[PDB]
Design a protein around this nucleic acid. Sequence first.
RNA 1: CCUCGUCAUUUAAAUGGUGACGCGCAUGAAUGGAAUGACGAGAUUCCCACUGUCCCUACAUGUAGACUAGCGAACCCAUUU
RNA 2: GAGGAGGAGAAGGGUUUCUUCUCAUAAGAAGAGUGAGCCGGGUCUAAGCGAGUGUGUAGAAGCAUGAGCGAAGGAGAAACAGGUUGAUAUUCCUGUGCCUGUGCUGUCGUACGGCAACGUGUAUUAGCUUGUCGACACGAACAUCUAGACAAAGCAGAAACACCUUUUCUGUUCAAGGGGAAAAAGACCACUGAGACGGAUCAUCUGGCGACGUGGUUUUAUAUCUGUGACCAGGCCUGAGCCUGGUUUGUUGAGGAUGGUCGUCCAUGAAAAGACAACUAUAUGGCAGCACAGUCCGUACCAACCGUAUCAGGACUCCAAGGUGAAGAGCCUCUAGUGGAUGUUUUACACAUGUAAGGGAAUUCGGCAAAAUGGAUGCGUAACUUCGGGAGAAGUAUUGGUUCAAUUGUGAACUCAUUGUGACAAGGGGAAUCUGACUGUUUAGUAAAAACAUAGCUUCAUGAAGAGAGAUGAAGUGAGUUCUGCCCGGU
RNA 3: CCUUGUUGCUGUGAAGGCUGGCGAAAGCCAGCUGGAGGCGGCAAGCCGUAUUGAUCUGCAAAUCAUUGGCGUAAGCAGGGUA
Lengths: 51, 245, 112, 87, 104
Amino acid sequence: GSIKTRRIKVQLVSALKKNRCIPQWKRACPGFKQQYNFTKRSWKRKTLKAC
Amino acid sequence: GKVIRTLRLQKEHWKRKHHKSKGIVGFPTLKNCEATVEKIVHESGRPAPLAIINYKKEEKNTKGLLVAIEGIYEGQKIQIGENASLELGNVCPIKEIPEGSLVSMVEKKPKDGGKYVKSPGCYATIVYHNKLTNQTTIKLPSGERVRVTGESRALLGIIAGGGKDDKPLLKAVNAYYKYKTKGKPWPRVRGVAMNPVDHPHGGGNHQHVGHPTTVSRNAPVNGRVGLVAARRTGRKKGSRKITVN
Amino acid sequence: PKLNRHKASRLDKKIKQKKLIEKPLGFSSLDIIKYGIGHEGAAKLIEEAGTLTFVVDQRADKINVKKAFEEIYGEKVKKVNINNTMKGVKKAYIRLVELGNAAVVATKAGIL
Amino acid sequence: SRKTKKVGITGKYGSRYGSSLKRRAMICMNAQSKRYCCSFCGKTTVKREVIGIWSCRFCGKKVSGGAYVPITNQQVEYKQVINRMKM
Amino acid sequence: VERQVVRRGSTFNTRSNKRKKVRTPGNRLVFQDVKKKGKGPKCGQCGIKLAGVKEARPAAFSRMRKSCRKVNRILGGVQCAKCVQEKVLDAFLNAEEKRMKELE
RNA sequence: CCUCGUCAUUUAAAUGGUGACGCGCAUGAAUGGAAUGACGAGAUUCCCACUGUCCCUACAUGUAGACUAGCGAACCCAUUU
RNA sequence: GAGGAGGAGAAGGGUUUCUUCUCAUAAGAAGAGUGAGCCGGGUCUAAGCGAGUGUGUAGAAGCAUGAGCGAAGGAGAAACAGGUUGAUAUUCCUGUGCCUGUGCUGUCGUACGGCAACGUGUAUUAGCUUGUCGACACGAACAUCUAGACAAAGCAGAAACACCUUUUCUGUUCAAGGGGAAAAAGACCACUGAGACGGAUCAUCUGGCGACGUGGUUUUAUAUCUGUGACCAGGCCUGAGCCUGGUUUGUUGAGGAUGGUCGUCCAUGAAAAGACAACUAUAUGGCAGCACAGUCCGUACCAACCGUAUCAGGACUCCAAGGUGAAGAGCCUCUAGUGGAUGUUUUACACAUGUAAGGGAAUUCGGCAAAAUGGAUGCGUAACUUCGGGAGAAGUAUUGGUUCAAUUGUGAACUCAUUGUGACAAGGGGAAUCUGACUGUUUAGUAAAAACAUAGCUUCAUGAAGAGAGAUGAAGUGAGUUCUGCCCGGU
RNA sequence: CCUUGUUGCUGUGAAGGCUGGCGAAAGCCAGCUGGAGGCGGCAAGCCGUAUUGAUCUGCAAAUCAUUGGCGUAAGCAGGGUA
Ligand SMILES: [Zn+2]
Ligand SMILES: [Zn+2]
């Protein structure tokens, strides 16, 4: 909801910046072997436990 | 089995709370005082009313609590200690009060603040003064006779609020309000209606105790239920009391 | 006294010691300001309300921002409002004592 | 007033609780609700605030008393004994 | 008929949350807040409310003029005219008995 | 227990109900005994009203079901029946 | 269908919100978006928790005292209208304000009046002490105010017209701050001097401790005015600006606010921070202008929450129109909001429902299920009973529309093709027996009961208390009425 | 245990009060006023008697329909604490 503590807000801000795919240029690099970022999440499928 | 109801209710988190209390009840310590009665008040757990008193100790005003005797009023001046007059509601040394008189809030030893008679409607009777030993015999409301030294103080009158037990509580809710502040279990479920894990009277295909209900004084605590160390039982007449002053 | 401090608004706690050598200039005007923001959202504010918008260091407060602007850019300030955004950036909005000067300072500084 | 032959103030309870118990309660219930005479001002304006405390609606004096009546039987007698001690 | 929302705070209808309905120049019906009522001084002897003094809440009372908070007599607010008449007489009459008991 | 005890009343007809009787396998007095009022989604018998419960079944309505487009599983299984 | 499938907050979720593009779609990718001295947190204290210290333990636990902590719905200085974005707004912009402090310049101050009830005067710090405010249960009736809703007249625009109609619909606005009545309800002051008697309430009641009367003093709302104009409706033109209105009266009325009364209780219904008055000393203090200051954290959105989900379940609160009727009941409408596995007339057996000749429980363990009765007004009401009840006992009759009398009691006439609480809503009743006195409670998920509880009755132990025999604990029986015989051999 | 929220419409008509009549008294009989109660019929709600109804590869690891019980109170509920 609208009321939040400072500690809860920083957790949300960090959880929101980490939630991104692999940038499209990295895929062209000779040494790079990852397909998809397995740390990506959806609000419909997991809980953060920020509480 | 498990621990019985009687033990659980004696643990510390079940003791009566004091948050609504007015203060500790008892006489001032000084040899002589003149006091004024400031207010007469009800205290949440107690049926007898309390009186707030005001008296000087050095230059400063100080406050105390007495149990109210019947017939005081707000604004009355009262006299405490040696050289007080025999007037209703004064406090005096016991040796000054004549035989056959009725007293309340009696000290068992000097400067204890007053114990003995403190419940609504009660009083004690002065039955004898011994001029050699300086003892006095008082008859307590249980019928017991006890000896106290002449230097102890006492309040002249009967405790306010008498007659309260005349009116029956006809309903369950009326009993609820009376026991809400006491330590006894209400409502009280009978032991014969429990299972044998919960109470020594539990179990069986008919509701019965099955063993005698009179138990020893030295029996172990988690089974000491029923009539503890009874001398006799039943509705028959007893015997003559033996009496000395 | 030790407590978990979960309801607190300031995340720092400890009082700070002296040191044998101290850092040259300290928390100072050129650490406080990061950049002015110039886009279609900001442009309206310069044109209508005489206010600039800036990104500022997390450690900064209203009094410090007021001083730093008057030191770097030179116009006098009426008000400062502050906003912690969902992207982890502290924004400051500064209104100038005379309007019109907002378009002068913005253009000199290359914000606009 | 007095529209009932026997039941008096206890008519509020209908047919519930026993007959014998109601006629004990009745004595106390009639006594509680009355106004009584003030010792200080003579008027009939004294009523009960709470058990043991009685109060005058004109002059404001408060006095200790019984649970259902201002002066109890033991008090009416004992008050006299004290007056004799003063002689 | 237009219906309202709570603009600020909580919906939970406690003593600190009284509201009234008001019509604005723009022809809207809106809720607006209400401050609690104040009780003024009662006499220290008898419980009667003192004449000549205003009733307000502690913060608002302190911002009024001193004349709103007293009467010009021996006890300002504090006590009523009858109780001071009694006090003045009592102190006089007691001193006269002491005078007599000293002279006799 | 014997037992569907005997006598009366209720029905055309009563292993039922109510009233009587009592050597009661093995009733009974705060392990509480006995007679009523008001109040039970408590257990039991009868009468009046009422009816597809029944004699004895018939017709009609909505929604599923049969057939059709799109989508699309599971229990179970030595199997030749 | 206003106890909404409407509009908003809390707990919980965390970008789900806005724009663009692509299908990959309850799918992705890239950007953008939350602004405060006056709203809430950071303060105070409840029940309570506790570092350290003392005592104890192999170390612990525990016990005594006690810094600090403990409520986003208890106490708690000061703000409101109207505008603006794709997305924020009592936070931004315009206007008018307020609280707490700081500094400059002017301008005044060092006291009086009334028999009194008390008034005039915007007034400094500091301290004892005494008191007040903060600061408080439930229930009932009666006043007064404000939202709201009606009805007439005026104007502006709409709807409807084969016929009829001045028929019908929508509008007619005024914030915080400043100034301010009459009224009603209570206190009190001066004169006066009252009864087998006057005054007064819906109801209690009230007076020589001073009635009625005649003149005053004070406490508590609201209407009205200002708030410098905003905002709305309509017309003319238009890639813009002008012009015209926003006027009067009556009835009712809270599910909000306030006031003084009355009732109930073996139940009498928080603290503290922070304030104020009197008394005593001490005095360069009041007001007007102008200027300066007020840090830190939260602020988007939810039909998106918990149940493995896009789940008929669960989940704390606020606002609330017209008719019918006793009634935020059911039924019907205005404001605001809403919807998809496709076609086919589709047997039998189902699941939700209707109706039935003659008979009327013959059915079945058993009237299980269904039918019948139903609101208001009147007449008339038994055994038994703790005299309160039983009791709506039972049993019977009336009820629509129209046009009149009469004024709360109701009467009378005329009229209709099955009759009238016409739909919706809405008791079946009596005679007996067993059992528990009554309202209440229980096996969340096969048992709601005769079981548990309960008021009352009886027994037992104690003079120890932060409690003191009308007390504090332990057992048994189960309201009331009427009784409660005999046995101490065994344990 | 501490701090809070939540009662709308109706029936019956106790205590107390005022008039009129009857009586030598004591105190009896009418009509009106007043509004008590773990008191009656209902609403919002809280619950769980029957159909041994529907469902039993469920909408659901306890739900749905009609029918029922209480509803001015030993009633229901949020947060803090034990
Ligand atoms: Zn008096
Ligand atoms: Zn006074």
